Amino acid sequence: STKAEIKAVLNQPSGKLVEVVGTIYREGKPVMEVTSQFLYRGEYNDYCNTFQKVTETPVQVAFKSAKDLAVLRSKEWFHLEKDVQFDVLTFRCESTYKFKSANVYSSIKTTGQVLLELPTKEVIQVGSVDYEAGTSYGNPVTDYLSRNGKTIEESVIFENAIPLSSGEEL
Amino acid sequence: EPVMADLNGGLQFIDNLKDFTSKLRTDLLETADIRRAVSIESAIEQKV
Numbered sequence: 001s002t003k004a005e006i007k008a009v010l011n012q013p014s015g016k017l018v019e020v021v022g023t024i025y026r027e028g029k030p031v032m033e034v035t036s037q038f039l040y041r042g043e044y045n046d047y048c049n050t051f052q053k054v055t056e057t058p059v060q061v062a063f064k065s066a067k068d069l070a071v072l073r074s075k076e077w078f079h080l081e082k083d084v085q086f087d088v089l090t091f092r093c094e095s096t097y098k099f100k101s102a103n104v105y106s107s108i109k110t111t112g113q114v115l116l117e118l119p120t121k122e123v124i125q126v127g128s129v130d131y132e133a134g135t136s137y138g139n140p141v142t143d144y145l146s147r148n149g150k151t152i153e154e155s156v157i158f159e160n161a162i163p164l165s166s167g168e169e170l
Numbered sequence: 171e172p173v174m175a176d177l178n179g180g181l182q183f184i185d186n187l188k189d190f191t192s193k194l195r196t197d198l199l200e201t202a203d204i205r206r207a208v209s210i211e212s213a214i215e216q217k218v
Binding site for chain 2: 066067068070071074075136137138139140143144
């Protein structure tokens with residue numbers, strides 16, 4: 001069987017993009033995801049009926065000084081729910097944008113989980129993200145993680161890419 | 171008489187003056203930057 005959810009309906013200068021991610025189920029368990037992407041070409045000003053759901057890149061912020069714990073406790077979107085000292089934090093985060101013009105936002109909802117790696121390799125959540133605003137121009141939560149931490153990069157690219165097969169064979 | 175004039179204003183009655191003035195200089199530097207780096211990040215978060 002198949003259940004599908006729609007991710008992003010955004011008005012571009014080249015049209016109206018539609019991304020649909022349809023997760024195929026089998027005996028209850030999910031098997032594979034199909035990330036399809038369409039386009040209604042033309043010009044469309046329907047900024048009232050557009051949105052975007054993005055799963056953000058996991059950013060690993062490394063705390064080394066003593067002012068760093070003071071900063072994110074001033075961030076009202078951060079709320080730690082435990083009295084646990086922490087060295088490094090990975091923020092696995094998801095966002096939901098709604099637009100009002102071409103690059104302004106009508107609303108932003110940014111939630112997410114913050115994570116701590118213990119020395120005994122157990123992962124326990126320290127707290128949560130709860131950001132919500134209207135009529136903004138960017139996401140603060142991601143822009144904070146854009147400069148104050150590195151992304152957990154899994155797509156590690158080689159220095160010189162190697163061709164697999166060469167000639168006309170293909 | 172040879173005359174010692176101890177014009178030190180009571181500072182010999184402070185145990186471990188090195189470690190005492192170290193923590194007062196640290197705490198005023200550690201208060202100044204947490205009030206800085208918060209007001210730096212809260213400035214740019216309003217720019218976003």
